[PDB]
Structure formats: structure tokens, C-alpha cells
């Protein structure tokens, strides 16, 4: 009945594995428009069009810091573009503009017969992710585009902590011992500011600012939560309602909060 449901019914084991059911291919965007560079990850034979997610790194950082999300999310039924910004020193608002620019190019590549993702994307269903200033940029993207279906920034930082206008379902990955974007002055005030959406706050125990980046030691849990959140809210897939809204009840988590997220 749900036209957006893709893939086998999920289990904890399949969501915690390094890769999901779908085989992933990838290509580099030939002529990136409105951002620095892009890598597109997409699944082969997902059984239908899938949503698109754009992921942005942080200040001084590049695709490598966030690249692990590409294959992980794509293997579960998403088209994912990881970008480099025009300059590694771009601010959150500029990161948001380039993040949305990347999503627009994915939409155009969906209508380009020469592109590997031709006809593979439901361009009405998109999501935003990112690290640090790119997580702040994801929150700005969500606030400026309620058309988006989900957001999952990690260790976000922005000049402001007020994102009360966000109606997009938003999962915040936080890192307990973050000394660059401290939780008490960034992630948690941002989480508490949002009262008009489904939201979740997941703090990684003992995590530094890079606790959700490529190579991190919690990829099973973080990857499960990222995919589950995107499945529940970009696909409206109630098979993932428990995975997306549950307290993991794990010693890997030092703080868990959620609101408007029923199981």
C-alpha cells in the first residue's frame, strides 16, 4: 500500500551491518553546479524511485569526513550526493545554499538520459545531512525549505541556536565531549528550540567532534539510526517506526531524547 517502501523488511542485524541489501555504484559529478565537487551513490534495482540525500562536510573538511554515509545509505535505497564546498572555509549559510544546489543537480541528473541515476529519483522526497558547519547548514536548509522530508545533521554548529521554525523531521547526532561545537551551546540548544516537528537527540558517549565521521567506532548504531530515520520520514515507512523512534538503550549513548516520534 505504501508506494515508497523499498527493500526487504528490516532487522537490527541488517541495519547494523556495514552495507544493506542493495548493491551500490557511484560516479563523480562531471560539471558540479553551485558547489565544489560531488560524488553520487545510488542503488542498483531498488524496485522503484527513491529519495535523495545531500551531505555536506564541515569547516576545513572534505568529502572524506562524511563519505561513509554514501554507500551506507545508498545500500538501503537512497541516492546520496556527498559534496565538497566551493571553499573549505565557507560558512553554514553558504553550505546550505550549496547543499540545496547539489540536490537540484541530482534532480536534473534524474532527467538526464546519460546519467546513471536517470529515472531513479523521486525528486519530491529529499533530505539533508552534514557535519559541524555542514550540520548547521542542514538545519538552515530545513528551516528555509519545509519541502524537505528529513534532516540528520551530526555535531551541528551555527551562529544561532534558534531553529524553532523547522517542521522537517530532524535527528541530531551529538558527541558528548565535543570541544569544538559543545553540546551545551550547540546541539542541545538547537534540539530544544524545535517544537514544531518530530525530532530526536542522540548523544554519543565519550565522542569527540568527529564522532559520527568516516572511520568512527559506532557505525553500527549511527548507521542504523541514520537509515531508520530517513526510511521512516522520507519514505513514510512505518516498518522503521520503532528503529527510528526507540531509545537504543546502549552504553554507546550518553543522552537520548525524542519528541513526536511514536513507535
From Swiss-Prot:
Domain comment (free text): PETase retains the ancestral alpha/beta-hydrolase fold but exhibits a more open active-site cleft than homologous cutinases.
pH dependence, record text: Optimum pH is 9 for PET film hydrolysis. Optimum pH is 9 for PET (commercial drinking bottle) hydrolysis. Optimum pH is 6.5-8.0 for BHET hydrolysis. Optimum pH is 8.0 for the hydrolysis of pNP-esters. The enzyme is active at pH 6-10, has an optimal pH range of 7-9 and it is rapidly inactivated below pH 7.0 or above pH 9.0.
Xref: Pfam families: PETase (PF12740)
Regulation: Salts and glycerol enhance the enzymatic activity in vitro towards pNP-esters, while detergents and organic solvents reduce the enzymatic activity.
Reaction it catalyzes: (ethylene terephthalate)(n) + H2O = (ethylene terephthalate)(n-1) + 4-[(2-hydroxyethoxy)carbonyl]benzoate + H(+); (2,5-ethylene furandicarboxylate)(n) + 2 H2O = (2,5-ethylene furandicarboxylate)(n-1) + 2,5-dicarboxyfuran + ethylene glycol + 2 H(+); an acetyl ester + H2O = an aliphatic alcohol + acetate + H(+); a butanoate ester + H2O = an aliphatic alcohol + butanoate + H(+)
Residues that coordinate or bind poly(ethylene terephthalate): 59, 133, 157
Phenotype when changing residue 133 to A: Displays decreased enzymatic activity on PET bottle and on BHET
EC number: 3.1.1.101
The protein, known as: Poly(ethylene terephthalate) hydrolase
Pathway it works in: Xenobiotic degradation
Family of this protein: Belongs to the AB hydrolase superfamily.
Keyword GTP-binding in annotation: no
Primary location recorded for the protein, binned into one broad class: secreted
Domain of life of the native organism: Bacteria
Amino acid at each position: 500500500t505504501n508506494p515508497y517502501a523499498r527493500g526487504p523488511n528490516p532487522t537490527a542485524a541488517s541495519l547494523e551491518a556495514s552495507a544493506g541489501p542493495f548493491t551500490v555504484r557511484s560516479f563523480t559529478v562531471s560539471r558540479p553546479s553551485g558547489y565544489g565537487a560531488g560524488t553520487v551513490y545510488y542503488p542498483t534495482n531498488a524496485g522503484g524511485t527513491v529519495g535523495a540525500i545531500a551531505i555536506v562536510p564541515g569547516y576545513t573538511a572534505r568529502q572524506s569526513s562524511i563519505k561513509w554515509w554514501g554507500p551506507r545509505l545508498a545500500s538501503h535505497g537512497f541516492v546520496v550526493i556527498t559534496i565538497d564546498t566551493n571553499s573549505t572555509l565557507d560558512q553554514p549559510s553558504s553550505r546550505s545554499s550549496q547543499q540545496m544546489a547539489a540536490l537540484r543537480q541530482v534532480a536534473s541528473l534524474n532527467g538526464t538520459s546519460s546519467s546513471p541515476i536517470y529515472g531513479k529519483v523521486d525528486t519530491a522526497r529529499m533530505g539533508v545531512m552534514g557535519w559541524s558547519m555542514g550540520g548547521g547548514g542542514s538545519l538552515i536548509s530545513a528551516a528555509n525549505n519545509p519541502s524537505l522530508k528529513a534532516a540528520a545533521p551530526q555535531a551541528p554548529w551555527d551562529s544561532s541556536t534558534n531553529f524553532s521554525s523547522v517542521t522537517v523531521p530532524t535527528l541530531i547526532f551529538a558527541c558528548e565531549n565535543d570541544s569544538i561545537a559543545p553540546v551545551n551551546s550547540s546541539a542541545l540548544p538547537i534540539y530544544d528550540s524545535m517544537s514544531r516537528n518530530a525530532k530526536q537527540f542522540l548523544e554519543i558517549n565519550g565522542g569527540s567532534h568527529s564522532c559520527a565521521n568516516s572511520g568512527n567506532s559506532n557505525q553500527a548504531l549511527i548507521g542504523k539510526k541514520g537509515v531508520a530515520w530517513m526510511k521512516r520520514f522520507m519514505d513514510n515507512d512505518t516498518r522503521y517506526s520503532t528503529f527510528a523512534c526507540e531509545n537504543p538503550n546502549s552504553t554507546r549513548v550518553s543522552d537520548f531524547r525524542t519528541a513526536n516520534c511514536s513507535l
